[PDB]
Design a protein around this ligand. Structure first.
Ligand code: ZPR
Length: 727
């Protein structure tokens, strides 16, 4: 007797006709099309959001395990967190720090040579440089990025107010840190520079430290609460001390408003790379200019790097006229190649060949002539050292560590700081010093979590057959003392797309779920990701997207068949592209799943191109307005494939979405929740929408909101699957 669902107005006439290769045309009905109108523009959308919000709150709050979860999460989340040390041109190391339950990581610094005094029981040490929590009253304003002037006197930084893809760029002196005395709701100590209407932090200082390049868009009233396509990306140069109105236009392309464009300077500041993107594929239109020839503006001598739309190019470094690129040019797994700007017609020369069995994730220069490569092989990271001059192998480092690495250190430094993490390791900072034949490794600092004994857990590697017989890898994290007797709950997380690998990643909350509910945490490395190189992505996109859903369903069947999980206690979870996975799998195999968690899900696979950044995803999903693509998209589009109610028991489903979410428009969740509640008015399992009116994502917003969302998710799974919380 948790019902009834709040009513939702239907438009029974609303339909769009799509061209179809098989059927000539298909008229598709959308009775909830009015919920495409943003919250702030429609009283109907407002009434839907408020009624669904209130309904979900009432259901979630009637479970006593919700408060129990909130308390469990507050205790366990209260641990000291930090990044590796990042060396900067002002002669300081910078590091992120959280004392425990602050919304945003704070930026601390220490004089190079004094770093052995930081991150102790006494506290972070060094000096507090920047506290993003001070920027807002709610802790929802976040640092989107930062870059120091080459001179080391200035610091350019991005702030997004409500966690949307809108930010302003500020500048402050490196002599002007945030003082501890200062209170919330202000950014004291900044210079007057304010760069508005930015949607991504790609910022390059000129070597004269007089100004920086940036990308911006036309102004927008509904600041991240609109859902119009993101259009008319422009490159500008800002001179320090000038109003944004004086900024010089570097590039615009009015013919192609859907293109995204940015510039990047080589570390020397001599060469500028222009890159335009027309979709989510790893392909660019690229141009190089030599800043020793040009004054900044629309009068720069742009040179051809390579034919457009064949490859992506990222700067690794430069040596005079030679530029080092990480590129996928005739190499889908990426490689390192050099360009001589003095011989453009010779094109690119291979320095490090493509590895046919490993995705090259990053390439960086250290100790003058050591090339550090991070490879993704078999769904985890490997570090290889190469000679910059010859490309000759100089050996592996951190081979004994299975997980992922974040590498800090510049070409002029003999040292790197490497943050290692996995499903079981929250964060170990190693220091590595390059030598002639071998280096020196030391453990600098390790994150400890008082609230949880990590030795109680194990991560295994299994391989399971998908529907088509493809062998898929899965990671299984679990408590060592849990019996595989077919009674355990599972939390099964998937994404499957955009060459994004699900690599070993530390999540405290997930391990608390495993301990408290005696549960298994399953990460199937399904197609669409880069776990087995770029071909793994190709086998899970466009007309092969169904492979992703089949891989995920087969993972669940395997866990049940091999007694890892109860048939009655499978919870699946996914976000963004992961939401196509959760909603498709719920439609295609509702009987496998007891609980489905969808975070900012993409669900309407016909209408996705019409909103914010959606048109770029046509490279991944296909173009719904193309007759050939329409047929394979329409087969799985979860919004259009909700099972007929008479012979399906739909799982319990909880949808998270945000008001400022301009990445995936909330309308996806709005319409699907409306449709599910309409199809299954009597459940028996509830379909709920949990909305945050004050963020545009679910990480790097207020700790209060994050705790409540997690307490809602875990308490909802507990209720839906009939679980008891263990001490
Ligand atoms: C989440 O998975 C959504 C839905 C499908 C793909 N996607 C993304 O967020 C993709 C994947 C990586 C980044 N991305 C994206 O949309 O970036 C475009 C962009 C957004 C904001 C500024 C600049 C570019």
């Amino acid at each position: 007797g948790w019902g009834p669902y709040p009513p939702v107005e239907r438009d029974e006439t609303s339909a769009i006709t799509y061209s179809s290769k098989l059927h000539g045309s298909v008229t598709v009905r959308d009775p909830y099309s009015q919920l495409e109108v943003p919250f702030e523009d429609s009283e109907e959308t407002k009434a839907f959001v408020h009624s669904q919000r209130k309904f979900a709150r009432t259901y979630l709050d009637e479970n006593p395990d919700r408060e129990a979860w909130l308390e469990t999460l507050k205790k366990s989340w209260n641990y000291r967190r930090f990044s590796a040390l990042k060396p900067e041109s002002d002669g300081h190391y910078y590091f992120e720090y959280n004392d425990g339950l602050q919304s945003q990581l704070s930026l601390y610094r220490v004089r190079m040579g004094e770093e052995d005094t930081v991150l102790t029981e006494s506290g972070p040490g060094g000096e507090l440089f920047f506290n993003p929590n001070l920027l807002s009253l709610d802790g929802n304003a976040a640092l989107t990025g930062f870059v120091m002037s080459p001179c080391g006197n200035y610091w350019a930084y991005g702030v997004s107010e409500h966690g949307s893809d809108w930010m302003s760029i500020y500048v402050r002196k490196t002599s002007s840190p945030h003082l501890p005395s200062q209170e919330r709701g202000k950014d004291p100590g900044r210079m007057n520079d304010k760069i508005r209407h930015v949607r991504f932090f790609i910022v390059s200082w000129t070597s004269d430290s007089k100004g920086f390049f940036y990308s911006r868009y036309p102004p927008e009233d509904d600041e991240g609460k609109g859902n119009a396509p993101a259009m008319n990306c422009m490159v500008y140069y800002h001179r320090i001390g000038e109003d944004q109105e004086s900024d010089v236009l570097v590039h615009e392309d009015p013919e192609h408003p859907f293109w995204i464009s940015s510039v990047q300077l080589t570390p020397s500041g001599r060469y500028i790379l222009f890159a335009a993107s027309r979709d989510a594929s790893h392909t660019q239109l690229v141009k190089i200019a030599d800043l020793h020839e040009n004054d900044i503006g629309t009068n720069m001598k742009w040179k051809n790097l390579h034919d457009p739309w064949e490859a992506r190019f990222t700067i690794v470094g430069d040596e005079g006229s030679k530029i080092y690129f990480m590129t996928n040019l005739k190499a889908k797994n990426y490689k390192v190649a050099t360009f001589d700007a003095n011989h453009p017609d010779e094109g690119l020369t291979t320095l490090i060949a493509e590895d046919p069995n490993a995705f090259l994730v990053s390439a960086s220069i250290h100790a003058q002539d050591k090339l550090l490569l991070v490879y993704l092989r078999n769904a985890s990271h490997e570090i290889h050292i190469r000679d910059l001059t010859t490309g000759k192998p100089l050996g592996r480092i951190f081979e004994d560590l299975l997980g992922q690495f974040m590498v800090s250190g510049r070409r002029q430094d003999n040292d790197i700081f490497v943050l290692f993490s996995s499903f079981l390791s929250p964060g170990t900072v190693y220091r590595y010093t390059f030598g002639e034949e071998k280096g020196y490794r030391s453990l600098f600092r390790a994150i400890s979590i008082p609230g949880l004994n990590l030795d109680d857990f194990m991560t295994e590697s299994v391989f399971y057959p998908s529907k088509d017989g493809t062998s898929v890898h899965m990671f299984i994290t679990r408590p060592k003392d849990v019996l595989l007797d077919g009674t355990s709950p599972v939390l099964q997380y998937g994404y499957g797309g955009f060459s994004l690998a699900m690599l070993p990643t530390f999540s405290l909350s997930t391990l608390l779920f495993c301990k408290i509910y005696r549960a298994i945490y399953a990460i199937p490395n399904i197609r669409g990701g880069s776990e087995y190189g770029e071909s793994w992505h190709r086998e899970g996109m466009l007309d092969k997207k169904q492979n992703v859903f089949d891989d995920f369903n087969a993972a669940t069947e395997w866990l049940i068949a091999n007694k890892y999980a109860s048939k009655d206690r499978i919870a699946i979870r996914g976000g963004s592209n992961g939401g196509v996975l959760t909603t498709a799998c719920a439609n295609q195999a509702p009987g496998l799943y007891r609980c489905v968690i969808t975070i900012e899900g993409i669900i309407d696979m016909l209408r996705f191109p019409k909103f914010t950044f959606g048109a770029s995803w046509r490279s991944e999903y296909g173009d719904p307005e193309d007759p050939e693509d329409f047929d394979f998209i329409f087969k799985y589009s979860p919004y259009h494939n909700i099972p007929p109610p008479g012979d399906t028991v739909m799982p319990a489903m909880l949808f998270f979405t945000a008001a400022y979410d301009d990445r995936v428009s909330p309308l996806h969740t709005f319409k699907h929740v409306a449709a599910l509640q309409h199809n299954f008015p009597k459940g028996p399992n509830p379909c709920l929408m949990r909305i945050d009116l004050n963020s545009g994502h679910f990480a790097g917003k207020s700790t209060q909101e994050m705790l409540e969302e997690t307490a809602d998710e875990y308490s909802f799974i507990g209720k839906s699957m009939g679980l008891t919380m263990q001490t």
